[PDB]
Structures are given as C-alpha cells and as structure tokens.
Design a protein around this ligand. Structure first.
Ligand code: HSE
Ligand code: HSE
Ligand code: NA
Ligand code: NA
Lengths: 330, 323
C-alpha cells in the first residue's frame, strides 16, 4: 500500500470538489495498491472556510518535485504555467481542467503532451467524455465537427427560451459554479474557442493555433430572437465548428440557427457531434460545467493514470480536410 | 520506422473493411513510425482482399506484432488467439461473444492490457472509452440500445413494416448476425452488456447472469398502441443495483417518446452517475465500415503506447437499489 502523492493547485470550487471526491473514493484507490496523500493544496486565502484541512493549505508555492501527480485547478494561465513546468520537466504528470492554459501556453506544454504527461479530459465538457470520444473517433477521418461546448452560455440560452432575462440567467449560472471567474470568456465565445482549439489539436492538427479560431458570442441574443427562432422551427445555440475550407481546417464559434430536431438542438447538456468516414454520425452529450462534473473528469484522469495509461496526445501529424464543409448564423 | 506485422482472423465484411482501411490510411501509421504489413488473412469462405494474402488454413501467429480478430464464434477464435496472448502479443477484436463467454480464459490478458475491444460494443461508436471516462463517477443506472438489427426492425415496424420483411431488409444492409436469433432474442445485446458491466462495475460479471429477452412479442399493432400513449418500445440493456448487487437485463421497454434513448437513430448508451449527472453517446452500432473504424481506433490506441481495455480493478458497490 504505497502512497499516491498529489500536489493540488487550487482550493476553490473545482479543487475542493476534487479533494473531497478523492477522500470519498479512497477505498477504490486501494484496488491499485495506493493510498492518496496530498502534499499540499495551493490556495490564495488560507482563512476562507473550505472542505480541505487547514494543515494542508499552502499560501505560497510549495515544492512539487516529490509529487506523483500535480492536479491543477488554480485559474489563469501564466502562473499555473510557471508552477507546473518544473514538475513536467521532472516527468511528473499533470492533470488539469484548465482549457485557457492549454490553449494559450501550447508552445511550452505541447512537448510534454506529446510524451503523455498531460491529462485533460475535464478541460472540455468537464467529466463528460469529449477527449476520449475523439480518441475513438480517430478510427475515422473527420468530415465535420460541431459542439455546444460552453455550459454557461447553453444555460443562459435555455433560460432565455423560457422567457428569463440574460442578466438573471447569468447570475444563476455563476451561483451554480458554471461561469468562468471572468464570465466574459463564456459569453463572448472565448471559452468555447479554447475548447475547440484543444479538440482540433487532438484530432486533426497538433499545432492548431488558438488565434486562428474565429469567435463570437451570445451578446446579440434576446428572448425575442429565441422566440422568433422557435416559430421558424429552430433553436439558436452557440456552436463551435471545425470543417474544411479550401483545403484547410477552419475553426469558428458563433450562434447558429439549428433545426429544432437536431441532436445539438435537443441536447439538455453540452454536446459534441461528429461526421467522419467510415464511421458515420456520432454524438456525446452530458454536463459540461460545475464542480462535481469537473471533478469527475479530473478523477477519471487520475484512474487513467493509475491504471497505467498515458495522457492525452496531440494528433501525430497535421492532415488536411477530406472535403469542403459548411450551420447558418443569426 | 518499424514494420507492424498484422495477422487478421476473418475476411468477411468487417475483416475486409479493416484490411482496406489500414492500407488506405497507411500515412496515418507512418506518423507513429510504423508501416503496416499483413502476414495473412484467415478466411472461413474461400472479397475485397487480394487472393494471395488469403489463408484457408490457420497460420502461425507468434511472429505477429498484433492479432486482429473479426471471425465470430467463441471456441475456434479462442484457440487461435490464446497462444498469441500467451506470447504477449496484443489482440484487437470486435468479437463480443468471445469476450462474454470465454472470460475465464481471457480475463488475465485483459487485466494486463493486451485486449483492445472498442469495436465489440457499438462498433466504432465510443462505448468502452465512454465508460472509461465515466469511471470518474459511480454508476447509478445504465441503459443502452446495443443491437442494431433489432433497432432497425422496431423502427421499421413503427412505419408498419412486418417483422419478417424488416428483418430481411436488415439482412441485405449487413446488420444481422449470420443467425439473426442472436439479435432478435436479445443475446447479442446481452453479450455487449456484459462487457460494459465488466469495465465499469464488476470485472467478474458472468454473461450467464444477464436476464435477456428479445422482441418476439412485438408487432406493428403493439408499436402503434405505444405511439398513441406517447411511448416508443425499444430493446434496452440495463444495468442497476438491486438488493446490494448489480443486475443486468435485456428486454423491450416502453420509453417516453422524447427520451434520448427513444429519439436515437443509432445505437445509444445512457448513464446516470454520481457526481457527473446524466450523459449519453450515440452512433452506428453495426456495419463493416463502422466496425472497422473501431478496430482501427484501437490500432492507433495501441500504436500511441496506450494499453488495451482493462476490467474494473475490483467490483464496485451499487449506490442505489434502482429499477
Ligand atoms: N465556464 C465553463 C466551465 C467548464 O469548463 C463553461 O461554462 O463551460
Ligand atoms: N448483429 C449486431 C452487429 C454489431 O455487433 C447488431 O445488430 O448490433
Ligand atoms: Na470531458
Ligand atoms: Na464501440
């Protein structure tokens, strides 16, 4: 019964949900010969009430190099980057839900992702299978991908359909723990753009640049626009699309007018829809935000690791699209 | 650059789609530093594979890097694959009957990461990888539509087609097992359910504990009565706790018409789990190209250095006495 030494960066909603899920499932972990021990938990304010023992809280960065895993849920990009690099350089894996970090700091992190050191299932659609879904879809050649990747904005549109205001729905989504610390990221399409980038890199181009995604959000939408779409037989959603234009992959995020019977329109959670050759049309859906939903993703990766599987790899080379693709905007 | 020496067992619709997919996608493989080299294709009936590669009799597998099996049956493929597994050679298979019935012999190799079998449930639609990620949570209930032939038949009988006429149409389309009994009496669903249970909740789950029935009581009139009640009938494979133990069943179920499982056009797996919540995957569960996508996914999984599909490390406790 060896120690599994975990350094946890972040003690907010996700880090806490993680810490507690680990404790609750500690029995399950003995089935691999380990007992989880947290070396420490990086938090901003050690005085806040928190379901993590005081004795483990760290206000300043702590040495990571004795850890077996670093789990990162601390927010931002540059700071987590500088903290995880020394661990990665030492061959310590990282488990993360940090889609901005992966999207924006890929020059530094790609070499370690290539070595199977980075697990990030929870960085897209939380614990809903998304990266594992695309790992399987590698069996085919991608024709087109369209996803509703951002939970906060799905929630807002679902509530506006029911007549609720933008502002009301937003505030609710922040209370549910769906929104980013900057909710602009959610509502302007940027969070969906981060996630789209990561899907592109896994599936078709390991160097795909975040800056190439063309993103717009939901700031022009209102209950009246969604009610006019309901009368046309349509639902408006924020959709992240990857498709071929002139022999190159084009990535875009934008509101789209969907037929109301489409899988993407009827999904209650977040959703990822793929057409690929020769499989055909496949889709996955589930909760794409929240503390528990995200911790399920991080824990799934912890189990992937402990089972002996490596992390999520980028696509082994870039390849061009098989066909010219094209949903209608609002 | 290394040669990947592949022994393919089966030259039917699946074997053939797989052979052609591997050669068509040989550039994809060279991005892992390999070149695919088939040793031979074992064939039952002496298709879209060169005649010179066909083998009417079994061939030594021990110099293979990988064995791929899409032969069907149990004991014949088992005896052909076991010497390879004993030598540490991995197996990629779509053969759900084999895994469900010969688990006493196959489990120890599955536990060492030598068996890849995504294609064995819902073909190349993610099902085993979906549950691998769901292990982050604990299962409360699982329900799937795991057989394509019976989904086709029910869908056609909704439209007023008779059982026999839909089954023949399913047979032309290539969905049905060679004996359609395995489809229509729920057995094929019950093989697949067993495999899902062993991955997620109990690595010793016996195929014999699955309580399976098929679609033989169903007709166009029954499905129309269900439609008038706002329901669809489907053949559903369920996994749920009852008095402290996991139970597995296959049977026709009256579903709400707007349920994800009722609205799915292909196979579907629907789960509630703690703390994730409700998740769902759907896509084609049958067919040559669909199956071949699964087997090739597994090949790429293997070549990237990831092990095969592991059983659950230990039986898990049910959280809910459901139904
Ligand atoms: N703000 C994100 C959180 C989960 O990544 C969302 O709404 O999807
Ligand atoms: N006969 C099976 C093939 C897929 O394994 C079906 O109908 O689902
Ligand atoms: Na995910
Ligand atoms: Na599958």
């Amino acid at each position: 019964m060896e120690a599994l030494k975990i350094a946890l960066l972040g003690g907010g909603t996700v880090g806490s949900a993680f810490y507690n899920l680990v404790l609750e499932r500690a029995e399950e972990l003995s089935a691999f010969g380990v007992v989880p021990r947290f070396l420490g938990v990086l938090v901003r304010d050690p005085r806040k009430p928190r379901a993590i023992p005081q004795e483990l809280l760290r206000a300043e960065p702590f040495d990571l190099l004795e850890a077996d895993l670093v789990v990162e849920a601390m927010g931002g990009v540059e700071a987590p980057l500088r903290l995880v690099l020394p661990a990665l350089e030492a061959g310590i894996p990282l488990i993360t839900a940090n889609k901005a970090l992966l999207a924006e700091a890929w020059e530094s992190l790609r070499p370690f992702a290539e070595e199977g050191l980075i697990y990030h299932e929870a960085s897209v659609m939380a614990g809903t299978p998304a990266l594992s879904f695309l790992e399987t879809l590698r069996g085919s050649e991608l024709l087109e991908l369209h996803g509703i990747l951002n939970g906060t904005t799905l929630y807002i549109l679902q509530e506006m359909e029911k007549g609720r205001t933008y502002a009301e729905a937003l505030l609710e989504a922040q209370r549910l723990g769906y929104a980013e610390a900057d909710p602009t990221l959610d509502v302007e399409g940027i969070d969906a753009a981060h996630k789209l980038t990561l899907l592109a890199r896994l599936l078709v181009d390991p160097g795909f640049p975040f800056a190439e995604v063309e993103a717009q959000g939901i700031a022009r939408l209102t209950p009246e626009v969604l009610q006019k779409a309901e009368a046309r037989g349509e639902r408006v959603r924020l959709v992240a699309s990857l498709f071929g234009e002139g022999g190159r992959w084009r990535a875009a995020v934008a509101p789209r007018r969907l037929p109301q019977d489409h899988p993407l329109a009827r999904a209650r959670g977040n959703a990822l829809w793929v057409r690929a050759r020769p499989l055909g049309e496949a889709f996955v859906t589930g909760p794409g935000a929240g503390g528990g939903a995200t911790a399920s993703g991080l824990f799934a990766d912890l189990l992937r690791f402990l089972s002996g599987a490596p992390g999520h790899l980028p696509a082994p080379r870039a390849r061009p699209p098989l066909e010219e693709g094209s949903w209608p905007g609002v």
